[PDB]
């Protein structure tokens, strides 16, 4: 039984790979110039890491990263993709006269057979909030094909978490559930479901961008080193935090973004999704507290963000947060698989 | 006395204490619409006052008696229960009108007058017209009115109209949601959120608003002071059927009133409607705890029931219904604890 | 089960997950044409419900059952297969109606009812009426209907008409021409342009539009739910012969539908036509691969063939020719994957 | 009852009506200085509470009792005379503390408490510390205090300082001069001007102010709640001799207060001084009838006599004199009828 199928509900995998089979989705991702230009720069400026080397491209989609590795001089690139996009990748490899160097291997990286070990693995394994889609585990799984000296592009990933204040976002989600307070919608009392409705809406992480002035403390960083991490490390991800509050006011939740670094032989190239940086198709992610916490400047906001992988290729998110000085505590559960796209 | 029988002593003490303050008198007198309109009603109907006997109920500083004197009254009995009666007597002497204005200290339900009067003047209107229950004292004073005497004001019109105001609703809704907190300094308050919502939404909101928030033609409820009895004001039932002109959320009902001075020379109107300059009565809005949705052309039907209480005010019951869909709203309000938002 | 034999498990999982969300219930309930017309149809035909036995197929939060209760029904069996069933149960208790509404979690093809019913109520219509294949569940439920029995809705009319929309047509190639460039970061993408075009044209466009784009009076295809059987919906052939009211280029066919509640006291209609206020069903347009020129008074004839698939939707095949000239066009579309264009 | 004999019914009615409102509880609870300081005082002196018996006098919604429970109190009697006692009970039940907090509706002068307590907690301070005459109920409750028990707060310090505020002084006459016109709609109002003036000057002004209007270091009058008897508060004679730090016109006296929680571990201070963040106690200013000129280095002497009355408040008689010149002034004010000037 493949490692992939054992961790993944089939109904989730069918939807997931159908979504990624669409050329329109490829175009959406490729037109992110920050993402595409930073990947090409990371590969081309570290060309010695690719010249005359064997490369594995995990989840290659249309194959763009494999074309970048070929531009950098790779001797051989195995491009693995499990969606039907694999067949379009083959078309581009032929139309670009790279049949001698790029070899598309359709299927899941956990189930294919690669002809040889590789010098470097390249991929775009990052989902929303970094961890969504559980692709990082496939990326890590692929290290079974990596030589001892081998490198990984990207090499590390940093998840950033910071408390924010945004009463408009909070009230927007809060009043959405207010529909269910009605004691007489067309004569029907709906209010018994108001609780369940508010929980539903607040379980959705909010995906959009925000002004960095809504952040109330320096971010906390949590780092995964892809060269050293193992698949199982991502089944349960525990991120403690202790924020030193820089402004007073209501904390409505935690904001999340991530950076990855391509640590090459010639230079390290960073790809950032921080709200201080140009927007990308990852945006940023915010998990709202069902009830905001009040904190004064100089207070400490401490707790834990716990991510439990689930069989729908995503994570159950638990956030418990505490204003230490007063003992005001907030607990929240979020379903990362189904965010609210607000942008 | 009729007054004491219907009034808790603690309420009456505070009430007449409030009206004893000259600053409160100044506040009402500086309302130029109020004072200029009353003077216009009296002076322009001077034939209803020339060489007549007048009763002024709750005269305060006495301004209306001075107006009656300017219009030619022969004798004016000015009745006032608060300590302001002594300041009014001071003004009568300083204005050399001791021969025409006779201040009688006391409650109009309790004092004695030496003769029947031709006309009664008063400012009995509180917030939403009925607050303070002064209209019953005004009506009670008709025991001193000659058989065809007049009353200034003569009639009163209460208007009510549904309104939409998401900001006002959310402001009160959000105040109450402080008690949703599961861990305020470590304490779960949420068990009291319902009670908080009740308390905040029982408060009539006294302020003014742009008329664009009104979603139907107002419905009018008329009290004819020449005809009504005290007891008519103990339980006031106001049915309403609104024909909706706009679609959206009805957050509550807005109230205002006009009074008419029906004199022999002219009728003169004093209006507190939102289409008119602001007065110290403002306008009053009763919020539904949950708004009702309605489309243009639906009818919004229900009843506003006012029951007088012994704190000189009213318990307000509003039941309303979108007839087409059966969406219903029931609400209770304490007119004596208004929220002054202006 | 009849439902499982016609439905891939992967499609059913996602389908019911979707209808488990209160936000989806909320969106449908806030469609005032939808909710208000159903209430009007039921209450104004109160003698079809007074002291009757009712079956509610796919009741969601249960609102149609509450309407049947407002109309005096003695017993209502409300069947719902998604997790929304648990929420309907809460509402039946909180509205003190456990004595009259019995919520039955499950597929109507799999549950058991204790007794036969006088009337079936349902909202089985999807996009283009037929999407979701819920009509078959509605018809299947007739095994529980008494010979006298009625159905609410009683009939459904699907309307087809030819439209001209130059801008909608050209948009497809503007999108696809993203791939028609020789050096996207060094890669020649042009070989995938044809596939990108093909992908866009297979999507029905869910949108509303101005009725002035219609070039001929609509043609109607009627399903009588009192007479139809499930298998009648596996292959739906809709012939058409449009008489062109205007000259121009025909870029596709527009779809909408009405249903009628044929009651003892009156017939009430729910219409999603572009001449009526917009509903959450919108309208649907299927483009032709190549536009067809027709002159006013010409005749545009052909067929729309809908073939049910196991993803709870239809493969759409449309063929059309202008009789006077012979110019012909086709198109194959996947109703399961509409393009939501509404703005 | 002691409370009955010192309080007119009309005043008591309105008083407990006012504190029956949850909006009033919310106002005080949302004062972070008030709420947070009480919490720190109790929590940071946990050895004063662990396994101890506690009396909470005038508990309102019950917050201090929950704090005493957080600190490990074995048992807490929470006494409240307003209808708010019913809401505190609800909160005790919802917080699963029925075993440790017992809510006693009624006046502390009239309830029966089952046993002596180790420590009394309360918030008995009104405007100017003494308004409302709650301190007497707090001291009366020491009939239930074990010998060697403690009081939280332990001491209260009222502060008096001379101030200059020309605009506040002139404002009285600008308001009264409304009456000084010969023909207000034809009526000569001028004979009431002097009465209007007198009315305004009887009112203490509740307001905050810039500390730069203060003309001398405050004089402090200390009540030690562990030693004082309730009779000590019936007549409070506060002598003062101010060493003027600035030259100018003295228009009246400013008042504020501090309280100290003198715990076994530490002492915590709650301050309403104008040098500190504003609280819902604000500050209080009593004008002299006429200003007194004083040079820096002069001494301003006199007395502030607070005479308790049956309206749960005080008559304030202030006499003051510039020693080096003999210039004297005075005023008599009704603390029950303050003018709230804050903007
Ligand atoms: C209402 O509708 C929903 O409910 C819904 C829910 C969502 O949440 C929605 C979210 C949306 N966007 C989004 O997520 N934007 C973030 C940008 C990430 C862009 N891509 C990436 N970096 N992700 C990871 C790489 C993926 C590639 O790798 C392949 N691949 C995976 N696994 C394997 C394997 N084992 N073997 C071989 N190949 C594999 C796979 O096929 C791909 O080609 C949009 C619509 C959404 C709709
Ligand atoms: C819960 O927070 C509170 O504590 C609170 C509550 C309120 O609701 C608050 C409301 C506030 N303003 C307000 O109401 N503005 C509307 C303008 C009304 C303008 N005056 C009028 N038309 N009132 C009726 C006539 C009164 C005169 O008639 C005398 N009078 C009464 N009865 C008798 C009697 N039997 N015999 C002889 N004389 C009698 C009485 O002494 C007076 O001179 C402010 C603060 C408030 C504070
Ligand atoms: C990007 O992401 C996608 O890929 C995607 C694809 C879509 O196309 C998307 C399309 C979207 N809108 C849409 O569809 N708008 C029209 C809907 C009309 C309103 N709903 C109705 N009338 N449908 C039919 C009734 C259904 C009820 O009946 C229940 N039910 C079904 N079967 C059974 C059974 N056997 N037993 C018992 N109960 C059953 C079921 O649970 C329900 O409660 C939105 C998001 C979409 C997302
Ligand atoms: C002239 O018009 C009036 O009439 C008037 C006069 C005023 O001056 C006005 C002043 C206003 N604001 C104000 O004061 N702002 C300062 C913040 C005070 C912050 N609260 C506090 N620390 N107060 C003392 C504790 C009270 C608690 O203790 C309870 N309690 C009392 N006695 C007993 C007893 N014997 N037994 C059991 N429980 C008892 C009581 O029920 C409470 O829960 C507003 C309206 C006012 C109206």
Query: CA-CA distance, A165 to A243, in Å (whole number)?
Result: 14
Query: CA-CA distance, B138 to B313, in Å (whole number)?
Result: 15
Q: Which chains touch C (3 or more CB pairs under 8 A)?
A: A, B
Q: Which residues are bridge partners to C303 per DSSP?
A: C239, C319
CATH number at residue C229: 2.70.160.11
The answer to whether the CB atoms of C22 and A187 lie below 8 A apart is no
Contact in structure between D66 and D98 (CB atoms under 8 Å)? no
Sheet of B299-309, strand order:
B235-243, B299-309, B313-322, B327-334
Of the residues C31, C32, C33, C66, the best mutation for testing chain B's interface (the one with the most B CB atoms within 10 Å of its CB) is C32
Using the Cα atoms of residue C36, residue C41, residue C47 and residue C53 in order, give the sign of their dihedral: negative
Rounded to whole angstroms, what are the CA distances from C178 to A21, A24, A40, A279? 17, 10, 19, 21
In terms of domains, do D195 and D220 share one? yes
Rounded distance from Cα C283 to ligand 3 centre (Å): 16
Residue list, annotated binding site of B: 25, 34, 58, 80, 109, 137
Rounded distance from Cα A84 to ligand 1 centre (Å): 13
Question: Could you say which DSSP state residue D190 is in?
Answer: G
The answer to whether the CB atoms of B325 and A182 lie below 8 A apart is no
Going by alpha carbons, the residue nearest to atom 29 of ligand 2 is B58
Closest of D162, D86, D147 to residue D117, by C-alpha: D147
Q: Which atom of ligand 3 is nearest to the CA of C281?
A: 16
Query: CA-CA distance, A316 to A306, in Å (whole number)?
Result: 8
Query: CA-CA distance, B75 to D124, in Å (whole number)?
Result: 55
Contact in structure between A214 and A286 (CB atoms under 8 Å)? no
Helix, strand or coil, per DSSP, at residue A183: coil
Q: How many CB atoms lie within 10 A of CB A73?
A: 15
Query: CA-CA distance, B202 to B157, in Å (whole number)?
Result: 24
Contact in structure between A270 and A41 (CB atoms under 8 Å)? no
In terms of domains, do D98 and D196 share one? no
Q: How many domains does chain C have?
A: 2
Q: For B130, what's the count of Cα atoms within 13 Å in the CB-facing half-sphere?
A: 29
Contact in structure between B25 and B62 (CB atoms under 8 Å)? no
Going by alpha carbons, the residue nearest to atom 39 of ligand 2 is B58
Peptide bond into D200 cis (omega under 30): no
Residue B205 tokens, joined = 């909101």
Q: How many CB atoms lie within 10 A of CB D113?
A: 16
Would you tell me the crossing angle of helices B22-29 and B32-44 to the nearest 10 degrees? Answer: 70
Give the end of a domain, one of D156, D175, D204: D156
Helix, strand or coil, per DSSP, at residue A249: strand
**Does D36 contact A at CB distance below 8 Å?**
yes
Closest of B63, B101, B72, B33 to residue B265, by C-alpha: B72
In terms of domains, do A195 and A315 share one? yes
Gyration radius (Cα) of chain C, Å: 22
Q: For C22, what's the count of Cα atoms within 13 Å in the CB-facing half-sphere?
A: 26
Closest of C152, C158, C115 to residue C226, by C-alpha: C152
Strands B283-294 and B299-309: unpaired
Q: What are phi and psi of C288, to 5 degrees?
A: -80, 150
Contact in structure between A187 and B326 (CB atoms under 8 Å)? yes
Q: What is the Cα C71 distance to its own chain's centre?
A: 27
For ligand 3, whether the C-beta of C145 sits within 6 Å is no
Gyration radius (Cα) of chain B, Å: 22
Gyration radius (Cα) of chain D, Å: 22
DSSP string of A275-333, one letter each residue: TTS---TT-EEEEEEEEEEEE-TT-EEEEEEEEEEETTTEEEEEEEEEETTTTEEEEEE
In terms of domains, do C130 and C217 share one? no
Query: CA-CA distance, A287 to A285, in Å (whole number)?
Result: 7
For ligand 3, whether the C-beta of C125 sits within 6 Å is yes
Rounded to whole angstroms, what are the CA distances from A181 to B61, B165, B285, B291, D70? 50, 18, 21, 10, 34
Q: What are phi and psi of A135, to 5 degrees?
A: -75, -25
Would you tell me the crossing angle of helices B193-201 and D22-29 to the nearest 10 degrees? Answer: 110
Residue C65 tokens, joined = 């059952």
**Does C36 contact B at CB distance below 8 Å?**
yes
Q: How many CB atoms lie within 10 A of CB A241?
A: 21
Q: Please check if D80 is assigned to a binding site.
A: yes
| Contacting residues of A for B292, CB less than 8 Å apart | 184
Q: Would you call B166 exposed, middle or buried from its count of C-beta atoms within 10 A (0-12, 13-18, 19+)? A: middle
Q: Would you call B156 exposed, middle or buried from its count of C-beta atoms within 10 A (0-12, 13-18, 19+)? A: buried
Query: CA-CA distance, D128 to D279, in Å (whole number)?
Result: 12
Nearest chain C residue to B247 by CA distance is: C32
Q: What angle do CA D14, D20, D23 make, to 5 degrees?
A: 115
Gyration radius (Cα) of chain A, Å: 22
Nearest chain A residue to B177 by CA distance is: A291
Q: Would you call A343 exposed, middle or buried from its count of C-beta atoms within 10 A (0-12, 13-18, 19+)? A: exposed
Contact in structure between C91 and A192 (CB atoms under 8 Å)? yes
In terms of domains, do B58 and B151 share one? yes
CA dihedral D244, D247, D253, D255 (to 10 degrees): -60
Is C157 catalytic? The answer is no
Give the end of a domain, one of C141, C156, C171: C156
Residue B110 tokens, joined = 């309790």
Q: Would you call D60 exposed, middle or buried from its count of C-beta atoms within 10 A (0-12, 13-18, 19+)? A: buried
Q: What is the Cα D112 distance to its own chain's centre?
A: 27
Give Cβ neighbours of residue B168 (< 8 Å, ≥ 6 apart).
B205, B251, B285, B287, B341
Q: Which residue carries 């959405």 as its tokens? A: A176
Question: Which range of residues forms the domain containing residue D312?
Answer: 157-340
Q: What angle do CA B80, B85, B86 make, to 5 degrees?
A: 165
In terms of domains, do A122 and A246 share one? no
The answer to whether the CB atoms of C200 and A24 lie below 8 A apart is yes
Contact in structure between B160 and B214 (CB atoms under 8 Å)? no
Query: CA-CA distance, A130 to A160, in Å (whole number)?
Result: 10
Q: How many CB atoms lie within 10 A of CB A12?
A: 20
Nearest CA to CA, how far is A296 from chain B (Å)? Answer: 13
Rounded distance from Cα D169 to ligand 4 centre (Å): 28
The answer to whether the CB atoms of D178 and B26 lie below 8 A apart is yes
Q: For D192, what's the count of Cα atoms within 13 Å in the CB-facing half-sphere?
A: 32
Contact in structure between B336 and B206 (CB atoms under 8 Å)? no
Q: Which chains touch A (3 or more CB pairs under 8 A)?
A: B, C, D
In terms of domains, do C186 and C143 share one? no
The distance in angstroms from the start CA to the end CA of chain C is 40
For ligand 1, whether the C-beta of A338 sits within 6 Å is yes
In terms of domains, do D192 and D302 share one? yes
Q: Would you call D112 exposed, middle or buried from its count of C-beta atoms within 10 A (0-12, 13-18, 19+)? A: exposed
**Looking only at Cα atoms, what is the longest distance across chain A?**
74
SS3 string, B77-115, reads EEEECCCHHHHHHHHHHHCCCCCCEEEEECCCCCCCCCC
CA dihedral B14, B19, B23, B29 (to 10 degrees): 150
In terms of domains, do D187 and D313 share one? yes
Among the bound ligands, name the one nearest to the CA of residue B126: 2
Give Cβ neighbours of residue A219 (< 8 Å, ≥ 6 apart).
A160, A161, A162
Rounded to whole angstroms, what are the CA distances from B44 to A6, B50, B63, D171? 95, 11, 16, 37
Give the end of a domain, one of B135, B156, B177: B156
DSSP string of A206-224, one letter each residue: EEE---GGGB-SPPEEEEE
Q: How many residues does chain B have?
A: 342
Contact in structure between C250 and C300 (CB atoms under 8 Å)? yes
Query: CA-CA distance, D64 to D138, in Å (whole number)?
Result: 14
Q: How many CB atoms lie within 10 A of CB A100?
A: 10
Residue B92 tokens, joined = 């009568």
Of the residues B14, B17, B21, B22, the best mutation for testing chain D's interface (the one with the most D CB atoms within 10 Å of its CB) is B22
Sheet of D75-80, strand order:
D101-105, D75-80, D53-57, D117-122, D145-152
CATH number at residue D53: 3.40.50.150
Q: How many residues does chain A have?
A: 343
In terms of domains, do A32 and A122 share one? yes
Closest of A206, A196, A176, A182 to residue A289, by C-alpha: A206
Of the residues C22, C44, C202, the best mutation for testing chain A's interface (the one with the most A CB atoms within 10 Å of its CB) is C22
Is A88 catalytic? The answer is no
In terms of domains, do C79 and C227 share one? no
The one catalytic residue in D89, D123, D207, D230 is D123
| Contacting residues of C for B295, CB less than 8 Å apart | 32
Is D280 catalytic? The answer is yes
Resolution in A: 2.1
In terms of domains, do C50 and C166 share one? no
Q: How many CB atoms lie within 10 A of CB A195?
A: 12
Contact in structure between D248 and D163 (CB atoms under 8 Å)? no
Q: How many CB atoms lie within 10 A of CB B191?
A: 15
Question: Could you say which DSSP state residue D23 is in?
Answer: H
SS3 string, chain C, reads CHHHHCCCHHHHHHHHHHHCCHHHHHHHHCCHHHHHHHHHHHHCCHHHCCCCEEEEECCCCCHHHHHHHHCCCCEEEEEECCCHHHHHHHHHHHCCCCCCEEEEECCCCCCCCCCCEEEEEECCCECCECCCCHHHHHHHHHHHEEEEEEEECCEEEEEEEEECCHHHHHHHHHHHHHHCCCCECCECCHHHHHHHHHHHHCCCEEECCCHHHECCCCEEEEEECCCCCHHHHCEEEEEEEEECCCCEEEEEEEEEEEEEEECCCCEEEEECCCCCCCCCCCEEEEEEEEEEEECCCCEEEEEEEEEEECCCEEEEEEEEEECCCCCEEEEEEECCCCEECCC
User: Chains D/C: 3 or more C-beta pairs closer than 8 A?
Assistant: no
Nearest to A95 among C70, C185, C191 (CB): C191
Residue C18 tokens, joined = 């979707």
Query: CA-CA distance, C4 to B269, in Å (whole number)?
Result: 76
């Amino acid at each position: 039984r493949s490692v992939f199928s054992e961790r993944t509900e089939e109904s989730s995998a069918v939807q997931y790979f159908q979504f990624y089979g669409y050329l329109s989705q490829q175009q959406n991702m490729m037109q992110d110039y920050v993402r595409t230009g930073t990947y090409q720069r990371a590969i081309l400026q570290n060309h010695t890491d690719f010249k005359d080397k064997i490369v594995l491209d995990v989840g290659c989609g249309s194959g763009i990263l494999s074309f970048f590795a070929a531009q950098a001089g790779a001797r051989k690139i195995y491009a693995v993709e499990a969606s039907t996009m694999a067949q379009h990748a083959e078309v581009l490899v032929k139309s670009n006269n790279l049949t001698d160097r790029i070899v598309v291997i359709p299927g899941k990286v956990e189930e294919v057979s690669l002809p040889e070990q590789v010098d470097i693995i390249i991929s775009e394994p990052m989902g929303y909030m970094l961890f969504n889609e559980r692709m990082l585990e496939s990326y890590l799984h692929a290290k079974k094909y990596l030589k001892p000296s081998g490198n990984m592009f990207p090499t590390i990933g940093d998840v950033h978490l910071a408390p924010f204040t945004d009463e408009q976002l909070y009230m927007e989600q809060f009043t959405k559930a207010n529909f269910w307070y009605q004691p007489s919608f067309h004569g029907v009392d709906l209010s018994a479901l108001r609780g369940a409705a508010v929980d539903e809406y607040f379980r959705q992480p909010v995906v959009d961008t925000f002004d960095i002035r809504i952040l109330m403390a320096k971010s906390v960083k949590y780092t995964v080193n892809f060269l050293e991490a193992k698949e199982g490390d991502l089944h349960r991800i525990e991120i403690p935090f202790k924020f030193h509050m820089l402004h007073s006011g209501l904390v409505h939740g935690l904001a999340f973004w991530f950076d990855v670094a391509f640590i090459g032989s010639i230079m390290t190239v960073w790809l950032s999704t921080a709200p201080t940086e140009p927007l990308t198709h990852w945006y940023q992610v915010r998990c709202l507290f069902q009830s905001p916490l009040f904190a004064k400047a100089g207070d400490t906001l401490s707790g834990t963000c716990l991510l439990i992988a689930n069989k729908r290729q995503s994570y159950d998110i638990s956030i418990v947060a505490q204003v230490d000085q007063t003992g005001s505590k907030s607990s929240n559960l979020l379903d990362l698989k189904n965010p609210f796209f607000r942008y």
